[PDB]
Design an enzyme around this catalytic site. Structure first.
Site, PDB file in Angstrom:
ATOM      1  CG  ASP A  19      -1.866   1.153   1.288  1.00  0.00           C
ATOM      2  OD1 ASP A  19      -2.080   1.794   0.239  1.00  0.00           O
ATOM      3  OD2 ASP A  19      -2.414   1.408   2.383  1.00  0.00           O
TER       4      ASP A  19
ATOM      5  CB  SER B 194      -2.470  14.194 -14.077  1.00  0.00           C
ATOM      6  OG  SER B 194      -2.660  13.742 -15.406  1.00  0.00           O
TER       7      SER B 194
HETATM    8  C1  LIG Z   1      -2.791   6.873   8.546  1.00  0.00           C
HETATM    9  C2  LIG Z   1      -4.012   6.660   7.671  1.00  0.00           C
HETATM   10  C3  LIG Z   1      -3.657   6.371   6.209  1.00  0.00           C
HETATM   11  C4  LIG Z   1      -2.996   7.579   5.569  1.00  0.00           C
HETATM   12  C5  LIG Z   1      -4.905   5.942   5.427  1.00  0.00           C
HETATM   13  N1  LIG Z   1      -4.583   5.567   4.046  1.00  0.00           N
HETATM   14  C6  LIG Z   1      -5.534   5.086   3.250  1.00  0.00           C
HETATM   15  O1  LIG Z   1      -6.697   4.952   3.651  1.00  0.00           O
HETATM   16  C7  LIG Z   1      -5.184   4.775   1.812  1.00  0.00           C
HETATM   17  C8  LIG Z   1      -4.755   3.339   1.578  1.00  0.00           C
HETATM   18  O2  LIG Z   1      -4.220   3.203   0.254  1.00  0.00           O
HETATM   19  C9  LIG Z   1      -5.924   2.352   1.740  1.00  0.00           C
HETATM   20  C10 LIG Z   1      -5.416   0.911   1.809  1.00  0.00           C
HETATM   21  C11 LIG Z   1      -6.522  -0.144   1.760  1.00  0.00           C
HETATM   22  C12 LIG Z   1      -7.489   0.007   2.935  1.00  0.00           C
HETATM   23  C13 LIG Z   1      -8.536  -1.102   2.992  1.00  0.00           C
HETATM   24  C14 LIG Z   1      -7.903  -2.492   2.964  1.00  0.00           C
HETATM   25  C15 LIG Z   1      -6.967  -2.650   1.762  1.00  0.00           C
HETATM   26  C16 LIG Z   1      -5.908  -1.549   1.718  1.00  0.00           C
HETATM   27  N2  LIG Z   1      -6.851   2.505   0.605  1.00  0.00           N
HETATM   28  C17 LIG Z   1      -8.152   2.896   0.634  1.00  0.00           C
HETATM   29  O3  LIG Z   1      -8.703   3.118   1.713  1.00  0.00           O
HETATM   30  C18 LIG Z   1      -8.916   2.992  -0.677  1.00  0.00           C
HETATM   31  C19 LIG Z   1     -10.397   2.688  -0.502  1.00  0.00           C
HETATM   32  N3  LIG Z   1     -10.633   1.252  -0.542  1.00  0.00           N
HETATM   33  C20 LIG Z   1     -10.581   0.558  -1.674  1.00  0.00           C
HETATM   34  O4  LIG Z   1     -10.329   1.062  -2.767  1.00  0.00           O
HETATM   35  C21 LIG Z   1     -10.868  -0.940  -1.559  1.00  0.00           C
HETATM   36  C22 LIG Z   1      -9.557  -1.716  -1.463  1.00  0.00           C
HETATM   37  C23 LIG Z   1      -9.739  -3.189  -1.228  1.00  0.00           C
HETATM   38  C24 LIG Z   1      -9.531  -4.093  -2.253  1.00  0.00           C
HETATM   39  C25 LIG Z   1      -9.655  -5.448  -2.033  1.00  0.00           C
HETATM   40  C26 LIG Z   1     -10.024  -5.916  -0.786  1.00  0.00           C
HETATM   41  C27 LIG Z   1     -10.230  -5.023   0.249  1.00  0.00           C
HETATM   42  C28 LIG Z   1     -10.100  -3.665   0.020  1.00  0.00           C
HETATM   43  N4  LIG Z   1     -11.644  -1.399  -2.720  1.00  0.00           N
HETATM   44  C29 LIG Z   1     -12.804  -0.790  -2.988  1.00  0.00           C
HETATM   45  O5  LIG Z   1     -13.214   0.092  -2.206  1.00  0.00           O
HETATM   46  N5  LIG Z   1     -13.615  -1.090  -4.179  1.00  0.00           N
HETATM   47  C30 LIG Z   1     -13.126  -2.170  -5.034  1.00  0.00           C
HETATM   48  C31 LIG Z   1     -14.263  -3.171  -5.316  1.00  0.00           C
HETATM   49  C32 LIG Z   1     -15.384  -2.465  -6.102  1.00  0.00           C
HETATM   50  N6  LIG Z   1     -16.394  -3.448  -6.517  1.00  0.00           N
HETATM   51  C33 LIG Z   1     -15.902  -1.674  -4.886  1.00  0.00           C
HETATM   52  C34 LIG Z   1     -14.916  -0.533  -4.572  1.00  0.00           C
HETATM   53  C35 LIG Z   1      -5.934   7.067   5.447  1.00  0.00           C
HETATM   54  O6  LIG Z   1      -5.864   7.989   4.632  1.00  0.00           O
HETATM   55  N7  LIG Z   1      -6.917   6.969   6.339  1.00  0.00           N
HETATM   56  C36 LIG Z   1      -7.991   7.974   6.355  1.00  0.00           C
HETATM   57  C37 LIG Z   1      -8.058   8.703   7.682  1.00  0.00           C
HETATM   58  C38 LIG Z   1      -8.775   8.150   8.751  1.00  0.00           C
HETATM   59  N8  LIG Z   1      -8.892   8.847   9.959  1.00  0.00           N
HETATM   60  C39 LIG Z   1      -8.338  10.124  10.092  1.00  0.00           C
HETATM   61  C40 LIG Z   1      -8.465  10.883  11.413  1.00  0.00           C
HETATM   62  N9  LIG Z   1      -7.669  10.703   9.009  1.00  0.00           N
HETATM   63  C41 LIG Z   1      -7.547  10.003   7.803  1.00  0.00           C
HETATM   64  N10 LIG Z   1      -6.857  10.627   6.665  1.00  0.00           N
END
Ligand SMILES: CC[C@H](C)[C@H](NC(=O)C[C@H](O)[C@H](CC1CCCCC1)NC(=O)CCNC(=O)[C@H](Cc1ccccc1)NC(=O)N1CCC(N)CC1)C(=O)NCc1cnc(C)nc1N
Length: 330
Positions: free
Chosen positions: A35, A199
């Protein structure tokens, strides 16, 4: 030193990619999701609540001889889709396809959200964002890439994701046989702790290229491509029957329609995403409505170049003092 590991799609839709990682002595192999949008290395373990594990491979700290509890350290993270996990911290040896890092912080999950438990193909995460986002408290920990940087032949790593097929993650070198033409580098902003770049524009199908700055992040941890409302509306307007569904929560289109490609700009270079890549299947088993791979970011607060865009290119993450992003066709 260097290292190369094969990354495989978890399902026929390329929803995510898992990579085998060796943890501990003797090695305990777990399949993690790399990630670039997070900076924590966490895994299922013998400490995770029994009811919250359903088929995932677990890490057993007491079975490793290099394992060592980081007294007082704790972690807690929550992701963009709402998932969450938390627990304690350990230090141990971690090898990714040959590349070995000793004393890496291995965050052992004590609690995981229900969405994680339901996912039996993902044993944990390996964050490759900037160390500033690590949630280990009260002593922040460094990421795996940051820990190996000094030993790599080149402070870089590359992402080569495949469409409905396996790909490669390389550490410390550029495989010049993996892409075509030249690599185009672009400035990276580390201000928010992400691989943030800009981009230069876009095109829909064979349409004229539109010069416009799009600020977003390169995130291998995100499935789809999230762009501004104006861009997304222009794309789906070229697909007969497509529409924004309130109930589904995004753009859907008739499963029988052909999708036009999408072009995004990198400097003066252009990366083309084939239309096939943008089809994410029936919203529900048996349905004739399909889910789109390009959705609006109007709600996220930032544009995200996820797997849908990344897997169409050979991507270089240059972790030099002055970090840059490299894009090439393949
Ligand atoms: C230290 C936090 C850190 C920076 C965190 N980073 C991220 O969230 C980005 C990171 O790339 C994470 C890593 C993921 C998390 C879920 C599990 C798999 C890995 N990405 C996302 O959240 C993108 C949204 N999710 C996704 O894109 C998931 C990924 C997935 C794929 C397969 C199986 C399971 C999950 N897939 C989908 O949502 N879809 C794919 C399927 C489609 N049919 C439906 C839509 C964040 O920003 N958190 C938000 C946050 C929360 N709280 C606070 C106070 N501040 C914040 N900024």
């Amino acid at each position: 030193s260097t290292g190369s590991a094969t990354t495989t799609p978890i399902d026929s839709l390329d929803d995510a990619y898992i990579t085998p990682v060796q943890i501990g002595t003797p090695a305990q192999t777990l399949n993690l999701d790399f990630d670039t949008g997070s900076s924590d290395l966490w895994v299922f373990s013998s400490e995770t609540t029994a009811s919250e594990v359903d088929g995932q491979t677990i890490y057993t700290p007491s079975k490793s001889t290099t394992a060592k509890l980081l007294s007082g350290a704790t972690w807690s993270i929550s992701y963009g889709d709402g998932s969450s996990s938390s627990g304690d911290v350990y230090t141990d040896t971690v090898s990714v396809g040959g590349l070995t890092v000793t004393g890496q912080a291995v965050e052992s999950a004590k609690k995981v959200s229900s969405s994680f438990t339901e996912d039996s193909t993902i044993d944990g995460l390996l964050g490759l964002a900037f160390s500033t986002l690590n949630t280990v408290s009260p002593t922040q920990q460094k990421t795996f890439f940051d820990n190996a940087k000094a030993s790599l032949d080149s402070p870089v790593f590359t992402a080569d994701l495949g469409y409905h097929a396996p790909g490669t993650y390389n550490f410390g070198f550029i495989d010049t046989t993996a892409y075509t033409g030249s690599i185009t580098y672009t400035a990276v902003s580390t201000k928010q702790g992400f691989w943030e770049w800009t981009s230069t524009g876009y095109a829909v199908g064979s349409g004229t290229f539109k010069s416009t700055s799009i600020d977003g992040i390169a995130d291998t941890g995100t499935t789809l491509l999230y762009l501004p409302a104006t861009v997304v509306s222009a794309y789906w307007a070229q697909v007969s029957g497509a529409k924004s569904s309130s109930s589904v929560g995004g753009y859907v289109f008739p499963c029988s329609a052909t999708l036009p490609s999408f072009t995004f700009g990198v400097g003066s270079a252009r990366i083309v995403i084939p239309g096939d890549y943008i089809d994410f299947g029936p919203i529900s088993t048996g349905s004739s409505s399909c889910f789109g791979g390009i959705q609006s970011s109007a709600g996220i607060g930032i544009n995200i170049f996820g797997d849908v865009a990344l897997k169409a290119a050979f991507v270089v993450f240059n972790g030099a003092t002055t970090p840059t992003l490299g894009f090439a066709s393949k």
